[PDB]
Amino acid sequence: VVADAGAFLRHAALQDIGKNIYTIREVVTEIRDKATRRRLAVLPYELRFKEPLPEYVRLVTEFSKKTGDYPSLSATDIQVLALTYQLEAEFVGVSHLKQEPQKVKVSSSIQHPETPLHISGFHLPGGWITPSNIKQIQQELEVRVGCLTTDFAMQNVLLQMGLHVLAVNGMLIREARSYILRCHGCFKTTSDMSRVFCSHCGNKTLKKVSVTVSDDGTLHMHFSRNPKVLNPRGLRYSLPTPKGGKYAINPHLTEDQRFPQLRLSQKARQKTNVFAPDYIAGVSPFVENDISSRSATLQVRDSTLGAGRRRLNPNASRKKFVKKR
């Protein structure tokens, strides 16, 4: 039972199920949540820290660089993989696990990548969210040593090698489906769903492609055969001359380019909380807006705000009295 930091984040109190509860010091010392650290000082201390012998750390690295998951994982994730590999080696025979992982098979379909399949509340033609389902909805849910890995790249390389992986649910996981991003310029895949520029070529060209791995060791990857996805409509537009100084917003063309700091005031990026027990004594139903700072005058916005505006293509007609900051 090797606990990833996802188990500690999720407060998965599964120490009673297993007895081989082991983990790295690095994964538990990197957590920045206060409630998790408070919960760490309360829990019964049966977990033990170790560091794997570095030889299996190499071996895990040479097949992760072959399975297409090496840029996605962290060093600590390689530590978790090496620790569960060594605990498998010490407890169970080593002939069970296989190397040189199997080639992916390709099968495309017609659905758009943004089709909201596998989102809980949604229903095409019953699928309801009951008070009985909230504890149930975690992920796709289906002997001595297991894992508590929630990142998909972890489960991908584990089920590729053949280690039995389990979840916050006690029963082990048989099937794992998710989404990845693939570049249509250099065809290199990333398991990080947040990232918008490619790791290899650096272009803003990653598009969503679904994957599913079995417990057997098979990875099969579903494309979308929809011509909407690969269409260059608003991709060529003329760009302004590059501007410097404290207030310049260049159009963000490379991943590691340097922006001037334009942060919101602490008053502006505060949202109203109504579940607080001191809310009803508060004067207003809502937090006051910031209209007094310098960033209010400079019209600084939250980075997440104004997203559907960006997906409108620049060579198009906006209304005649609006201005796009």
Partner: protein, 178 residues
Amino acid sequence: EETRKIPVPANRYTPLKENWMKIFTPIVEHLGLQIRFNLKSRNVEIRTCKETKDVSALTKAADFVKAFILGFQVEDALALIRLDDLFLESFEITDVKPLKGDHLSRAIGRIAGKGGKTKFTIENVTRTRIVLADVKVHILGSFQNIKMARTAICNLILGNPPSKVYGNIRAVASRSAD
């Protein structure tokens, strides 16, 4: 069992999807209601169940999702599931003055102000949330606060400059035992 259905327009589908967990968690936890999103009919469907604590929880959930779909922040409509004297009155801009074209456009502009400042300042005085859909104005707050907000907004879209409206709205707030 009784249910309500709340429509979603096409510009409110993606906000409904990103903010979905923040919608269905307080409805099902603190009110104990069933909820789904019918994609074929494009309706948010809210249904009573065995675990509902009391009557008029489902009306609270309906007002919550309605305020979200009109364009309010999810936190400002969690204010609807919590509080009892919060309503929403809306009107078109041409319900006050017949405006056509660029005049109408300027009306929207001088509701909002530069950077949105005017809007925010009105929200700071009347303690309301205003949302300006395409030609339409929606206010959220208490009853007397909503009528103060309408007075300020209607003065803005029958011509008066924002400075006059600022002074009038602060004076009216002072005389209202605020």
